[PDB]
Design a protein around this ligand. Structure first.
Ligand code: PEE
Ligand code: PEE
Ligand code: HEC
Ligand code: HEC
Ligand code: HEM
Ligand code: HEM
Ligand code: HEM
Ligand code: HEM
Ligand code: JZV
Ligand code: JZV
Ligand code: BOG
Ligand code: BOG
Ligand code: BOG
Ligand code: BOG
Ligand code: BOG
Ligand code: FES
Lengths: 379, 241, 80, 147, 241, 380
């Protein structure tokens, strides 16, 4: 082969996925999130390792090791900030990535979609175990509240839980296994991300009009490498602005207090990116039902590919679906909001409304409106 | 018991995203802590050396640390013993453990202040409103013996007796030691204790913004430049027809 | 696709039996062992030698090291 | 071979010996004076074992609280008469009730009120449920093994 | 200077790959340790509960642990205090710290025995040779005051006076407490303290071998079976010649 | 798409083209069984590693006892610990036979498969080095000290690089915590690089013991080699387990059953057997800097092998002079291993330099030379 970019067994790979890779000419900024998610992942792993090199997984030293890192390690405070806040940048990006997919029917690429669902699940597990590490009050209680949910599974209940804790409650044995899990999972994410992109390359990218872009493809480089680099700095600015000017904006002050099993914080609530699910959890008063609801709130994503009724791929030319789409987005902000609120009136009733509409829109309305729209096109 | 009073937003000199801490105020705040709060409040994460180059001279810090006796050891016979403090020592603990602390405060536990302004919603505005907010309970409300009424404390019955009053101490810099002046200084000090990186963090924020502005503009032009080829592109359908 | 593009091959016939028609370990004494011996024989003088030399050097050095720990009476013969 | 190796590795994740060693506590019933409440440490949290004198299975066992905040029926989940064993943790915010006071002669949580009777039931207070009652047994009367 | 006497190989009843420890011997060994060695030697990694089902009854172990007072706390007033031992406590330390230990042994530090037989080449053969090997120094050799001559100790001048002698104790099982009998028992006990898994490990080893023998043969046949096709294969060159 | 889903599917296709329909020479011997063992070995270390990691505490004040707590309290913790420590040795025995096979059969002529291989070895060594420090016993600490101090011998950037690595002025807690992170991490790099290793390899396919094209006679990897390899696995796995279950501490230093103490230097600071050969070479050059380079060279020398092939034939199967030279070299290595375990005194010192010298000579001068000589004896 003439150029070594195609013959070489490795460069060939780099070339067929980042240089001569055929990309639609009209993909928008919504397609910029895949790369941000990747970069985001590289960054979490990097700052993570740097933190891990100064952390001590022990109930008696965790809290202070994080403090020692922020107070003594050269730029430890900066690394800690970037890691904690990076987790949020990661979720913001992942939610927009998903949104883009629902709106544009990217889910029709079934395998790319399913691996994607798996990436999200793994990312959550990662952030959950990560959060416990500093061993502050919300660290401990959040760990407690969620893991206790599984004792609700009949039969294998108390077992699965005491197996997970490595004892009778969240304690040191839990902390150490959680550190190993936190260190490990990101690497599974990186792995699965490769599979994600592998299935994706079978078809290539979808585009905003939802029609074949074979008639007009352009090389990933320089078009998208530039577009993506730009998208990186555009997002990276607010990220840094937040982490450098308002470091604790998103965090709970309760975590600046060493965990204490003899003092339940008044309002045990998760980081923002889990609030929507926390709301759905509490919507079903009944330990077991709520757990299933929580599970279903995310597992529901595996069904999306089978609820597509439209004759068109995207929602670009489907105004009824478009509003339903934004209704859903608002539905989510509402759940997020309910999640941060105590379990009282009127939040309780509002919560069930939001939880119920959530599942209805995805399970019943979207497929239905899609069918309806097919008729209005005389199809 | 329901209903809570939320503190107001005071205009701290270190509130602006680009505004550092007033180190002169931090220095006085240290004095307050050292002469008043340190009697019952521990500050485990700060050491005398931390003061150097921030609020004190190296010579000053070394003297401050020596005013304290620390327990070192074991010695040859495996015995513990006292010794004068070094700048590497951390601010001394008022009590051996929490049990002893409660034992000396009516079963109440004065928390470590190293991260207090971040461990409380409201931060310094909260701590400040609390210190200067003690008053008599409103009608219908009875404070059980040992507790003191404070509208700013949840439940309104705090276990800490008003810690400060006018002239309770003298600032050796000649500042008028009024009660609110003191609270203001110790709160500014508490901010610094919670995050020594404060100033550097903001100085960095400034640099991040400028570079971010510059670089984003530059990259925007480059993206546009390359895409101009497709943006201005024109096409036509010409069948043999 | 790696089967079918390997080599240009002509005029070779091969005969093989299912594994169920034949024995797993046939002619152990008439063929196997003789060959095992044959294989050992053809190699022993290539492999063994240096390993044998290694052993010697090892033994020497170990014994020589212990001998140097012992005392030489010739250093005390006039210490009265 | 696989079944065993997997079993071994899997069980390496369950409670280790040092932990199981603190799994349960055995309390001697015949050394707990009447009326006087005694608290022991069990699983990092306080464990209450009070010896009901005579005016306890009566004074605080005949109460007529029509609508109860927690379906507390001693015949549902309890056992011994002059013996009451509770988990010394208020169900409000994890505080430890005190046996000295207790508006209803039982226990008092100095955190937000929560008054518990002699049977350890939420009376006057914010805490929803009643102090939890942990597993136990008397395979040896002059001894009880909680946990 | 580089001279050293290497112990001989005694035929321990737990030396065979398939031979467990003689638990009766381990039980006596514990007694030796408890009544003799524990005076100066700590065994930090073993707890009374560990004896249960190995050398003692649960009732026996609970009594053994109660013979000891342990320091618990803090209490209400943040005070340390004593309490009777539980089977979850570890064998008590003879000294607070190494400094105090040397202080009471002429600057010599009696090491923790939890892993001694694995922290020394020779293992129990070494510990046994040492205990029973004290003797007078040979001509030309002088042992400095405080040290005792032992040919098995490197340098031959050990800081431990011969710890055991005939009838220094009485075995409550009625075994004749001769010096070598004692050493043998405590050495067997030490083996167990270093590796409680010893018996389970060997029982497992047995199972690993049988299954290994079975599975390997089986797989050998299968490999052979499949390959038979190629092994017996015949070929010929038939050109149109 | 295609008839069977084993070829069409984007993933199974991968599994099929590397473990089922993968063309393999019909005559590869047991020496080709080490690649698969290395892979399995790697999966096992990672597995037992994680299980140990879940009970470990990277702190100088708790490390030693956390490992002890694992062995004494964790269900089968003692077994997992044994399998992990001994598995490291199974790993190296396998890696050394893998390399040997390669030298003897000219596998190195597959340059990229070879170079990634050298990288795998280096990464494996770093992994075991940092791993060894974790229990924080005496040899853990002193081995860490001895080796890391070697870099303060590098000119100008020396002292810096070292104090940077330690995170202070000596091997201490900051070193331990970063070593844990590295130990946890590197194995994953090994897995990664292993994929690249096999990727380059598949460009050519396996070499074989006669060193001539095997296109005329290839067989599917499955069942031929899947069976041969599974058999190879149990055959090796037996001695492994026998050792780990009957003689657990045969290979370890008793000195590591003593908590690290910076105020007591062990009499004989020496590594695990698989590093001894290199330790011998290190100590052969009295001169901190020269020895370090010699150590470095003892392994980096592997990157030159592809350029020192002079023979007209690929393997050594038909090259008797090279064959003896090959076994001379092997014996040379046992000798260095032996010297590595001995104190630095006569006669071990002189013997050591002889062995170090012959080591480099055989690979740098004799092998290429004898190869050329052999070419003439074939009238080539
Ligand atoms: C999920 C977790 C919940 C967390 C909260 C959700 C995030 C809340 C932030 C609000 C989102 C800001 C986006 C505002 C942008 C408005 C806009 O541009 O809309 C119009 C525009 C018109 O596009 P076309 O029809 O193709 O036009 C072509 C011809 N000119 O629509 C779009 O840009 C496409 C919308 C894609 C972005 C979706 C982002 C919202 C993310 C939420 C995730 C929801 C999905 C399911 C997750 C379940 C778990
Ligand atoms: C490196 C680190 C050093 C550690 C110590 C090295 C390992 C020591 C263990 C000894 C190795 C045991 C092998 C004995 C097997 C004897 C044997 O079968 O030899 C004869 C046989 C004849 O084969 P053919 O010529 O193809 O015959 C075909 C027609 N019938 O030769 C072979 O099997 C090929 C030899 C390959 C295995 C080499 C194993 C030794 C490993 C050492 C690594 C050395 C290389 C360089 C490393 C530098 C770093
Ligand atoms: C006599 C000991 C004592 C002194 C002196 C004292 N405090 Fe306290 N402080 C306490 C006690 C006791 C509490 C616990 C109150 C409670 O939880 O009921 C407390 C609590 C606090 C709290 C808030 C706790 C919460 O939950 O919000 C802050 C903040 C605080 N003190 C600040 C200070 C500062 C600043 C000073 C010096 C100006 C000071 N204290 C001096 C005894 C003292
Ligand atoms: C009076 C305290 C004391 C008693 C009692 C005692 N030892 Fe020791 N032991 C020591 C001292 C001191 C050392 C340190 C020796 C040295 O390093 O010079 C020691 C060292 C040892 C060593 C070997 C140290 C080495 O480096 O090899 C062993 C093993 C040992 N003791 C076993 C025992 C056993 C078993 C018993 C009970 C039968 C026992 N000791 C009872 C004082 C004692
Ligand atoms: C760590 C998480 C993830 C990474 C790193 C990742 C990465 C990527 C990348 C790089 C692309 C190509 C560029 C783009 O279209 O954005 C992509 C596309 C895609 N991803 Fe993800 N992804 C992640 C999570 C997910 C999730 C959670 C879903 C869905 C539940 C998902 C669904 C898709 C789909 C369906 C596409 C097709 C885009 C199109 O329509 O062209 N991904 N992803
Ligand atoms: C998928 C990427 C990752 C995510 C989403 C993530 C998320 C988190 C979260 C939410 C926290 C709590 C931060 C806080 O509030 O203090 C955390 C902490 C931590 N993470 Fe990660 N993490 C990631 C990867 C890693 C990796 C790869 C490592 C290192 C091998 C790591 C090491 C740590 C450590 C040591 C902490 C504790 C110190 C601290 O809390 O700041 N993380 N992580
Ligand atoms: C973690 C370490 C390694 C792994 C998992 C690994 C794995 C493999 C595997 C699976 C094969 C195919 C089967 C075989 O022929 O054995 C292979 C072949 C090979 N490997 Fe490695 N290897 C490792 C290290 C190395 C090293 C250190 C070298 C050389 C310095 C190396 C050189 C080669 C070469 C040259 C081949 C070609 C074999 C032939 O001649 O057909 N490998 N390796
Ligand atoms: C490439 C595979 C690996 C190698 C060659 C290796 C090697 C080692 C070595 C030589 C030791 C010291 C063993 C001893 O004598 O005590 C060790 C310890 C340890 N390794 Fe690994 N290891 C590997 C992978 C892992 C991984 C993936 C983890 C977990 C993420 C891990 C976790 C540990 C832990 C926690 C210890 C300390 C406990 C102990 O010393 O037994 N290892 N490893
Ligand atoms: C260890 O807890 N970590 C918390 C956190 O904020 O991490 C960022 C937290 C905090 C408070 C309450 C609940 C949670 C737990 O997260 N909450 C929910 C409700 C959740 C929802 C879905 C999935 C998952 C999981 F398991 F990660 F997969 C978790
Ligand atoms: C932390 O030390 N780990 C040791 C060990 O045996 O781990 C299994 C050890 C032990 C005693 C002496 C020297 C060593 C250090 O290893 N010694 C050598 C001589 C070495 C040689 C080459 C490469 C490497 C490295 F860095 F791993 F890459 C190390
Ligand atoms: O998807 C892509 O598919 C390519 C072809 O399989 C791989 O080489 C790339 O690494 C992968 O990212
Ligand atoms: C304000 O102090 C700052 O502290 C930093 C510590 O990270 C230093 O790097 C800065 O140079 C110094 O100015
Ligand atoms: C989007 C790209 C943002 C990069 C911003 C780089 C600014 C970091 O600049 C930092 O400022 C600190 C305070 O003065 C100094 O102490 C550091 O040495 C310096 O590197
Ligand atoms: C600790 O006891 C062990 O329990 C095992 C069963 O789990 C037995 O197989 C061992 O022989 C026994 O010593
Ligand atoms: C080559 C495959 C070897 C696998 C051997 C599996 C045998 C392990 O068997 C083990 O024996 C112990 C002693 O009885 C028991 O305590 C364990 O529970 C059991 O799993
Ligand atoms: S925790 Fe008991 S009354 Fe609130």
């Amino acid at each position: 082969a003439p150029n070594i970019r195609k013959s070489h067994p490795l460069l060939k790979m780099i070339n067929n996925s980042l240089i001569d890779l055929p990309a639609p000419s009209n993909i928008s900024a919504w397609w910029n999130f895949g790369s941000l998610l990747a970069v985001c992942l590289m960054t979490q792993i990097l700052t993570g390792l740097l933190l891990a090199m100064h952390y001590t997984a022990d109930t008696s030293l965790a809290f202070s090791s994080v403090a020692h890192t922020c107070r003594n390690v050269q730029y430890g405070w900066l690394i800690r900030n970037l890691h904690a806040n990076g987790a949020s940048f990661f979720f913001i990006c992942i939610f927009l990535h998903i949104g883009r997919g629902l709106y544009y029917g990217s889910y029709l690429y079934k395998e790319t979609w399913n691996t994607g669902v798996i990436l999200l699940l793994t990312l959550m597990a990662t952030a959950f175990v990560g959060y416990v590490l500093p061993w502050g009050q919300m660290s401990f209680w959040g760990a407690t509240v969620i893991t206790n949910l599984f004792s609700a599974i009949p039969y294998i209940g108390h077992t699965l839980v005491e197996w997970a804790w490595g004892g009778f409650s969240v304690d040191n044995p839990t902390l150490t296994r959680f550190f190993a899990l936190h260190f490990l999972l990101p690497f599974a994410i990186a792995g699965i991300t490769i599979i994600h992109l592998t299935f994706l390359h079978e078809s290539g990218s979808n585009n905003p009009l939802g029609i074949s872009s074979d008639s007009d493809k352009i090389p990933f480089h320089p078009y998208y490498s530039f577009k993506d680099i730009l998208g990186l700095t555009l997002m990276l600015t607010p990220f840094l602005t937040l982490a450098l000017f308002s470091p604790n904006l998103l965090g709970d002050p309760e975590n600046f207090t060493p965990a204490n099993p003899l003092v339940t914080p008044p309002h045990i609530k998760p980081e923002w990116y889990f609030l929507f699910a926390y709301a759905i959890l509490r919507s079903i008063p009944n330990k077991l039902g709520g757990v299933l609801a929580l599970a279903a709130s995310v597992l529901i994503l595996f069904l999306i590919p089978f609820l597509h009724k439209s004759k068109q791929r995207t929602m670009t030319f489907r105004p009824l679906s478009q509003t339903l789409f934004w209704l859903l987005v608002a539905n989510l902000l509402i759940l997020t909001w309910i999640g941060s609120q105590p379990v009282e009136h009127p939040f309780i009733i509002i919560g069930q409304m939001a939880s119920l509409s959530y599942f209805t829109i995805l399970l019943i309305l979207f497929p239905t409106i899609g069918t309806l729209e097919n008729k209005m096109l005389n199809y | 018991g329901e209903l809570e009073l939320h503190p107001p937003a005071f205009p701290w000199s270190h509130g602006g995203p680009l505004s550092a801490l007033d180190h002169s105020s931090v220095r006085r705040g240290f004095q307050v802590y050292k002469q008043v709060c340190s009697a019952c409040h521990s500050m485990d994460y700060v050491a005398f050396r931390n003061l150097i180059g921030v609020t004190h001279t190296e010579a000053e810090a070394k003297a401050l640390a020596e005013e304290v006796e620390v327990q070192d050891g074991p010695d040859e016979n495996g015995e513990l013993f006292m010794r004068p403090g070094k700048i590497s020592d951390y601010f001394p603990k008022p009590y051996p453990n929490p049990e002893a602390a409660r034992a000396a405060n009516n079963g109440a536990l004065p928390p470590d202040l190293s991260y207090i302004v971040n461990a409380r919603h409201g931060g310094e505005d909260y701590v400040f409103s609390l210190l200067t907010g003690y008053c008599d309970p409103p009608a219908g409300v009875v404070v059980r013996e040992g507790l003191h009424y404070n509208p700013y404390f949840p439940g309104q019955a705090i276990g800490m007796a008003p810690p400060i009053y006018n002239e309770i101490l003298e600032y050796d810099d000649g500042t008028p030691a009024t009660m609110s002046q003191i609270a203001k200084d110790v709160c500014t000090f508490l901010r610094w204790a919670a995050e020594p990186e404060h100033d550097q963090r903001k100085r960095m924020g400034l640099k991040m913004l400028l570079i971010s502005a510059l670089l984003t503009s530059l990259l925007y032009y480059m993206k546009r430049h390359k895409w101009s080829v497709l943006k201005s592109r024109k096409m036509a359908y010409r069948p043999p027809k | 696709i790696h089967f079918g593009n390997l080599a240009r091959v002509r005029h070779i016939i091969t005969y093989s039996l299912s594994p169920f028609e034949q024995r797993a370990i046939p002619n152990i004494f008439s063929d196997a062992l003789p060959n095992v011996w044959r294989r050992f024989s053809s190699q022993v003088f290539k492999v063994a030698p240096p390993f044998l030399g290694a052993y010697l050097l090892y033994s020497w050095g170990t014994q020589e090291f212990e001998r140097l720990k012992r005392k030489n009476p010739a250093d005390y013969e006039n210490d009265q | 071979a696989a079944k065993n190796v997997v079993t071994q590795f899997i069980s390496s994740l369950s409670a280790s010996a040092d932990v199981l060693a603190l799994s349960k506590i055995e309390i001697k019933l015949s050394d707990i004076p009447e009326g006087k409440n005694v608290a022991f440490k069990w699983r990092g949290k306080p464990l209450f074992v009070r010896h009901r004198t005579q005016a306890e299975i009566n004074q605080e066992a005949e109460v007529d609280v029509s609508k109860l905040r927690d379906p507390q029926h001693d015949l549902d989940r309890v056992k011994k008469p002059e013996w009451v064993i509770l988990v010394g943790v208020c169900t409000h915010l994890g505080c430890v009730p005190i046996a000295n006071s207790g508006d209803f002669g039982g226990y008092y949580c100095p955190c937000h009120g929560s008054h518990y009777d002699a049977s350890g039931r939420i009376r006057k207070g914010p805490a929803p449920y009643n102090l939890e009652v942990p597993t136990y047994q008397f395979v040896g009367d002059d001894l009880v093994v909680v946990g």
